[PDB]
Amino acid sequence: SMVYMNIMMAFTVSLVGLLMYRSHLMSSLLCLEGMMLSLFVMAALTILNSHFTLASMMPIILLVFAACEAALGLSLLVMVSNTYGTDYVQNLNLLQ
Amino acid sequence: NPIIFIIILLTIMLGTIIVMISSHWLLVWIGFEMNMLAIIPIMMKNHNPRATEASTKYFLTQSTASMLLMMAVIINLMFSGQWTVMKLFNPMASMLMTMALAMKLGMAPFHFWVPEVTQGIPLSSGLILLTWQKLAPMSVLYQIFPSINLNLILTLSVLSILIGGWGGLNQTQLRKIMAYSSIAHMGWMTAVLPYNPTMTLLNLIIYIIMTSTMFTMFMANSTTTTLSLSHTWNKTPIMTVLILATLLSMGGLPPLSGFMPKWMIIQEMTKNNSIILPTFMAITALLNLYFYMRLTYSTTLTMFPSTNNMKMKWQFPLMKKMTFLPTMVVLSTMMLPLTPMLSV
Amino acid sequence: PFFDVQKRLGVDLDRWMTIQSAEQPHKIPSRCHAFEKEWIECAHGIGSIRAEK
Amino acid sequence: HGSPNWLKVGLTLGTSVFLWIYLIKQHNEDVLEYKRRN
Amino acid sequence: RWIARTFFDGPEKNYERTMAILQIEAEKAELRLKELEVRRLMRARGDGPWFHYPTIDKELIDHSPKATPDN
Amino acid sequence: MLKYIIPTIMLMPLTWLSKNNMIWVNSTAHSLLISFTSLLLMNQFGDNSLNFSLLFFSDSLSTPLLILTMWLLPLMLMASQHHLSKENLTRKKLFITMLISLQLFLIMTFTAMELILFYILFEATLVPTLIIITRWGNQTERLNAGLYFLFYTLAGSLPLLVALIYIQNTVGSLNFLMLQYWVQPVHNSWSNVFMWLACMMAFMVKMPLYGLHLWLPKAHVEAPIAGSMVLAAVLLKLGGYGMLRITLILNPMTDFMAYPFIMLSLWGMIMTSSICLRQTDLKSLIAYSSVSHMALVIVAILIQTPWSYMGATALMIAHGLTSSMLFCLANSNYERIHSRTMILARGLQTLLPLMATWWLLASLTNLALPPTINLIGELFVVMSTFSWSNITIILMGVNMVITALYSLYMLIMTQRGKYTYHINNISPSFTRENALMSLHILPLLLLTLNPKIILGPL
Amino acid sequence: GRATFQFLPDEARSLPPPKLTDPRLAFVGFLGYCSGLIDNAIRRRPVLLAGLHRQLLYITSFVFVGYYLLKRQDYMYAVRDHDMFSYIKSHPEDFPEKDKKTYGEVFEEFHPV
Amino acid sequence: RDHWVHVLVPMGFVFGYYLDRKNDEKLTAFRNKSLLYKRELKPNEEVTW
Amino acid sequence: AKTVLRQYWDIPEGTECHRKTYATTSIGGAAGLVVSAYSVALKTPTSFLEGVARTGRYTFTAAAIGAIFGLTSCISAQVREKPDDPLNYLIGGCAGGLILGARTRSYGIGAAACAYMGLTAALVKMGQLEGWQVFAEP
C-alpha cells in the first residue's frame, strides 16, 4: 500500500552525492549504516504478513554482517585520522 | 603473522565458492560480502599512508556495490517469492541488478575503481588476487543471463574498450598500464554474453593465464617504464626476450595465442547477423596495442643502460608456476580445436 | 559457473528456505500456498523458454 | 665428485613409472572397453 | 621416358584424389547449414536440450495435511 | 607440400647445434639442397588440375611462384655477413633462425588450400619482419617506421575476418577453392559494395595504390644489415597475390566500381615514378621504382580476361629478381663509402671495373630489351588494356618514357671521375661481392628460352 | 546432456578411445619439451642440457593430462551430433526434401564482360 | 664424431616422405570414375595407391 | 526514447520540412544536456549557478546542429527529383557539421568536422535501406 511507497522513498538515504561527500567522512559512513533499516524494514514488512514461517530468520542475519561490515569500515576511518587528526574527504594524493 | 596470513588468504577463495555453490539469493549475498571483508588486510601489510588512503577508496566503492544487490533481491522477493538464482521477473530489478554488479567488475562507467586502487599499493607483489574479484560476479552473470535489457549490457561494454583504450596512452606507471587494458579485456567478454554465454569463459581462462604470467615477470625489481630499461644488460637478457613474447601474444597477433579468443568469438558474434558491432570493437583494440608496442620499444632495443651498477650475484626469488605459463599462453593456437568442448 | 556440487552428493546446503511451500516446521502454510504448488506443477520438465508463453 | 640432494632425485624417476604404468593399464583396459561395450 | 614412372603419377591418382577429398567436403559443408538451421533457430520451442533453461524442481514439494483447512 | 616444410624446419636445430664460426658454412650448405627437392615433385601436369594431398596443399598449381621463395635463405646469409660480424654468436644464431621462421610460413602460404588458412598465414608474418626492422638497423627513424609498417597492414586485414567468416556460414564453407563450383553472383546493392570493398582493401595496403603507399619508403629506406629483410620485403609485397585467388571468383561480376581503383592506380603510375628523379638517397631511389611497375599489376588484375594473366603473372617475378639485385647493388657499395647519398659515390667506374656489367645488366632489364622476362610481361599488359579502351596507350606509353630516363640516371652518376677524396674504397669487389650479385641474372635470362614455366592457367 | 557434474560421464564407453601416436599428443608435451628447456634458461643454469630429472616429468605431465583431457573433447562432439540428428529425425516439416534439378532449368544472369 | 649435425638432417626428406605416403593410403575412396580414371578390369588403376 | 525515432523515421520521409527539423532538433538538443552534466561533475565546480561549465557553449552548440540537420535534408529531398537517397542525405553531413566548424574557429577543425560527419551521415539512412540491425538476436 502506501506503507511501501513510504518507505521506498526512504531508501533514498544513499543519495550518492551524500554517500561520500562532503567532508567529515563520518557523515558519509553515517548513511551507510543508516541505509540499513530501509532494507531491514522493507524485508520485514513482506515476510510477516505473508506467512512464510522460515524466511524471517533472514532479517536477523541481515544485521549481523552489516554491523561487522561497518565496524571494519570504522576501523580504517580511525587510521585516516590517526595519520592526520581530521578525516576531510578532500584529502587526495593517489591520483587516477 | 605467518599462519594467520594463510587463513585470511584461504577464505578469499572460500568466499567465492559459496557464490557458485548456491541456489538461494541470501547465500550469494554472504559470498562476496566476506570477500570485501577479507581483502582489506592484504592491502595493508607494510602500513604506508598511501595504502591506507587507497583501501578506503577501495572499501566504500565495494560497500555500495554490495548494497544495491540486496536491494535487487528484495524487489523480486515481492514478485512471486522464488529465491532460486534465475531470471529476475521484473525489469525494475534486473536494471538495478546489472549496473550494480558492474562496479565490482568495474566497467567503463563506475570508472576509477581500477586505477586508483592498483596504483601505488606498495604491495605490487600481488594483487594477482584481483583476479578472484573478476571471477566471482562472472559466475553470477552465467545464470541471470536470460533476463537483461540487451542495451545496457552492450552500452557498458561498447564504452568499455573505447575508454579503457584511451585511458592509458598517457601513462608511465606500469601498474596502471596493467590496471588499464583490464577494463578492455572485460569489454570483449560481456559484449558476447547475450549471444551464446559460453565462449565467454574461453576469454576468461585465457585472461587469467596471460595476466598472472605478466606479474611474475615483473617481480624482479620493476616499478616504472624507465626501470624496465635497466634490466636487459644487467639482470638477464633472456628476460627481455620473454617479456616481448607475452605482450605480443596479449595484443592478439595470430602467430600467438591471444588471437585464439577473437577468432572464435566473432564466429559467434556474426552468425547472428550483427556485423557493425564487431567491426567497431575489432578496430578499437588496435590502439590497445599501442600500449604494448612503445613498451617493447623500451626493453628490446638497449635504450640507455646507464648508472653502472653490477648485479654480480644470482637471483633467488620464487617464480612459482612460471616455467609452464609462456608455453600455454603462446603456443596453444594450434592445440585448441576444442578447448570450447571441454569448457562447454 | 554453476558447479552444482549439492546435486551430486545429497546434502542440502540450503534449498529448504527457497520457495513459499517447502517444509513449514509445524505445517502452517502461507496465504498463497495453493497457487505455489499449482504453478510449480506447470513448468517442471518444460525448459522455461516455452513456459513463459 | 657429485653432490646433489639425493632425496628427490629419483622421485621424478619414480613418479613417471607410477604415472605411465597407471596410464598404460588405463589405456590397455580402455582399448578393450570399447569392444566390451560396443 | 625415365622421369615420369621413376618419380610421380598420372591421371589415375591426382584424378580421383580430387574425387576423394571432395567427398570429405560435401559432408562437411552441408552440416554447417544444418547446425545454423537448428542451433540458431530452434527457437520458440526450446525442444532439444540446447536452449533448455531450468525452472524449479517439483520433487521437494510437500503433501502432508498441513494444519490450515483453507490454504 | 608433402615435406618441404619438414626439412626446412630441420634446418633450425642445426644452427645453434653447430660449433663456432662454422655456423655460416653449415647453414648455407644444406639450404641449397632444398632447391632440387623444391623443383622435384612440383612442375607436374597440368590440365585441370593438381590438387595435391589434403587440406594443406593445392600445390600452387597454375601459379608456381614458390621456387623463388626458396633461393633466398641461401642468398641472404652470404649477403648479410658484411656488417653483422661484430655482434655476439648468441644473437647471430637468432638472426638466422627467425629468417628461416619467415620462410616456414611463406611455404604453407601461396598454396594454402583454403581462404581462411591463407589469412592466418597471411598475418603469421609481420612479427618476424618487425624484429628485423627495429633491431638491426642504423640511426633513428627506425621506431616510427616500425609502427608505420604496422597499422596499415593490420588495420586493413581485420575486415577480412569479418567477411571471410561471413562467407563460411553463408554459402556452404570456404574451406576448399574446389568447393567453389557453386557460387551465387553478387549484384548491385548497398551491402554488397562493402563485401567487395572490405575483402579487397586489405590487399591494396601491401601492394600499394598511389594513396596509402606512405609506409613503403619508410621500411625500405631505414633497413637492415645489407638488405637482409629488404630482399624478403619485396617478395612479401608480391606475396599479397591472393587477389588472384579471390577476385577471379567470389563476387565475379563487380567491375561497376573498379573505376576508382583503375584511375587512381593508372594516373598514380605515371606520377609516382616521375616523383623519384630528384631523389638524393640511393636506397630511396629504388624504393619508388618498386611502387610504379608493381602498381601496373593492379590495373592488370581488375581488368580480367587473359592475355593479361599471361603478363600479370610474369610481372610478379619480373622484378622479383630485378629489384632484389638492385637492393644488392646498393647493399654493396655502402660498405666502402658509409653514406647512401648518391652525390658522394662519384669518381667510380675506374676503380671497380668488374661490377660495371652488374650495374648495366640490372638497369638493362628496366629498359627491358625485349627477349627477357620483362618485355614479355609488359607487352601482354599493353595489348590487354588496349582492348579496354584505346586511350590507355598514352599514359602507359609515357610510363615507358620516363623510366628510361630514370634508370640511366642511376647508371650515369657513376661515369664521372677525379674522385677528389677517398683514401678508402680500396676493396676490389671480392669473390663474395660478385657471387651474391650473380645467381640473379643467371636465372633471369635463362628462363627466357622456354618461359612456358612462367604462365598462369591461363 | 543429463547426469550433471562429472568430469566425463559413464556413457563415454562406446567412444573409440583416442589412442596414442596422434600428433596432438605428440605436440602436447612438445611444448612441455620446450618448457623444460625454458625452466633452465630462466635461472642462469648455464647448461641448456641441465639436470634431466627436471627436464623429465614435464614430458610425463602434459601427455598424461592431455590424454585424460581429450577423452571428453571427443565425447562432447559425439553428444552434440547425437541430439541434432534426433531433432532432424522428428519434425519433417522443418526439413523438406529438395527437388533434384539439372542444368536445364536455370537461366542465370548472363553477364559477360 | 660421425656428424649428425651434417647430412643426417637432409635425411629427414625420406622421413618426411614416409608421412607423405600415409595419407593417400587412406584416401582410397573411388575406383569408380569415367575419365581414364577407369579401374575397369585391370591391375593398373589399382596399383600405385 | 525509441518512439521519438518512431515519429522521426515514420511520417515525413523528405517532405514536410518543418516537422522534420522540429523533431530532429529534439534528439541532438537533448544530448547537449548529457555533455553538460558530466562537464559539471567530472570537471570541478564552476561559477555560482552550476551548470556553468568552463567554456560554456555546450547546449548552445548541440541543438543548433539538429536544427539544420533535417533542414538541409528536407529542402534538398524534394527540390531535386523527389526520393530520399544516400546522396540526398549526404548533404546534411558537411554543413550540418560546420556549426561546430563555425564556432571554435576552423582551418584544422571545421573541414575535419565537415569531412568525417559526411561519412557518418549517409550510412544511417543507408542502414534501413539495406535493413541493417545493430543490436539483434537470432
Swiss-Prot record, chain C:
<keyword id="KW-0496">Mitochondrion</keyword>
<feature type="short sequence motif" description="Cx9C motif 1">
    <location>
        <begin position="32"/>
        <end position="42"/>
    </location>
</feature>
<keyword id="KW-0999">Mitochondrion inner membrane</keyword>
<dbReference type="GO" id="GO:0045271">
    <property type="term" value="C:respiratory chain complex I"/>
</dbReference>
<keyword id="KW-0472">Membrane</keyword>
<keyword id="KW-0679">Respiratory chain</keyword>
<keyword id="KW-0813">Transport</keyword>
<comment type="function">
    <text>Accessory subunit of the mitochondrial membrane respiratory chain NADH dehydrogenase (Complex I), that is believed not to be involved in catalysis. Complex I functions in the transfer of electrons from NADH to the respiratory chain. The immediate electron acceptor for the enzyme is believed to be ubiquinone.</text>
</comment>
<dbReference type="GO" id="GO:0005758">
    <property type="term" value="C:mitochondrial intermembrane space"/>
</dbReference>
<comment type="subunit">
    <text>Mammalian complex I is composed of 45 different subunits. This is a component of the iron-sulfur (IP) fragment of the enzyme.</text>
</comment>
<keyword id="KW-0249">Electron transport</keyword>
<protein>
    <recommendedName>
        <fullName>NADH dehydrogenase [ubiquinone] iron-sulfur protein 5</fullName>
    </recommendedName>
</protein>
Curated annotation (Swiss-Prot), chain E:
<comment type="similarity">
    <text>Belongs to the complex I NDUFB5 subunit family.</text>
</comment>
<comment type="function">
    <text>Accessory subunit of the mitochondrial membrane respiratory chain NADH dehydrogenase (Complex I), that is believed not to be involved in catalysis. Complex I functions in the transfer of electrons from NADH to the respiratory chain. The immediate electron acceptor for the enzyme is believed to be ubiquinone.</text>
</comment>
<comment type="subunit">
    <text>Complex I is composed of 45 different subunits.</text>
</comment>
<protein>
    <recommendedName>
        <fullName>NADH dehydrogenase [ubiquinone] 1 beta subcomplex subunit 5, mitochondrial</fullName>
    </recommendedName>
</protein>
UniProtKB/Swiss-Prot annotation, chain F:
<dbReference type="InterPro" id="IPR000260">
    <property type="entry name" value="NADH4_N"/>
</dbReference>
<keyword id="KW-1278">Translocase</keyword>
<dbReference type="GO" id="GO:0008137">
    <property type="term" value="F:NADH dehydrogenase (ubiquinone) activity"/>
</dbReference>
<keyword id="KW-0520">NAD</keyword>
<dbReference type="GO" id="GO:0032981">
    <property type="term" value="P:mitochondrial respiratory chain complex I assembly"/>
</dbReference>
<feature type="transmembrane region" description="Helical">
    <location>
        <begin position="224"/>
        <end position="244"/>
    </location>
</feature>
<comment type="subunit">
    <text>Core subunit of respiratory chain NADH dehydrogenase (Complex I) which is composed of 45 different subunits.</text>
</comment>
<keyword id="KW-0999">Mitochondrion inner membrane</keyword>
<feature type="modified residue" description="N-formylmethionine">
    <location>
        <position position="1"/>
    </location>
</feature>
<dbReference type="Pfam" id="PF01059">
    <property type="entry name" value="Oxidored_q5_N"/>
</dbReference>
<keyword id="KW-0830">Ubiquinone</keyword>
<feature type="transmembrane region" description="Helical">
    <location>
        <begin position="393"/>
        <end position="413"/>
    </location>
</feature>
UniProtKB/Swiss-Prot annotation, chain I:
<keyword id="KW-0813">Transport</keyword>
<keyword id="KW-0812">Transmembrane</keyword>
<protein>
    <recommendedName>
        <fullName>NADH dehydrogenase [ubiquinone] 1 alpha subcomplex subunit 11</fullName>
    </recommendedName>
</protein>
<feature type="transmembrane region" description="Helical">
    <location>
        <begin position="57"/>
        <end position="79"/>
    </location>
</feature>
<dbReference type="GO" id="GO:0005739">
    <property type="term" value="C:mitochondrion"/>
</dbReference>
<comment type="subunit">
    <text>Complex I is composed of 45 different subunits.</text>
</comment>
<keyword id="KW-0007">Acetylation</keyword>
<dbReference type="InterPro" id="IPR039205">
    <property type="entry name" value="NDUFA11"/>
</dbReference>
<dbReference type="GO" id="GO:0045271">
    <property type="term" value="C:respiratory chain complex I"/>
</dbReference>
<dbReference type="GO" id="GO:0005743">
    <property type="term" value="C:mitochondrial inner membrane"/>
</dbReference>
<keyword id="KW-0496">Mitochondrion</keyword>
<comment type="function">
    <text>Accessory subunit of the mitochondrial membrane respiratory chain NADH dehydrogenase (Complex I), that is believed not to be involved in catalysis. Complex I functions in the transfer of electrons from NADH to the respiratory chain. The immediate electron acceptor for the enzyme is believed to be ubiquinone.</text>
</comment>
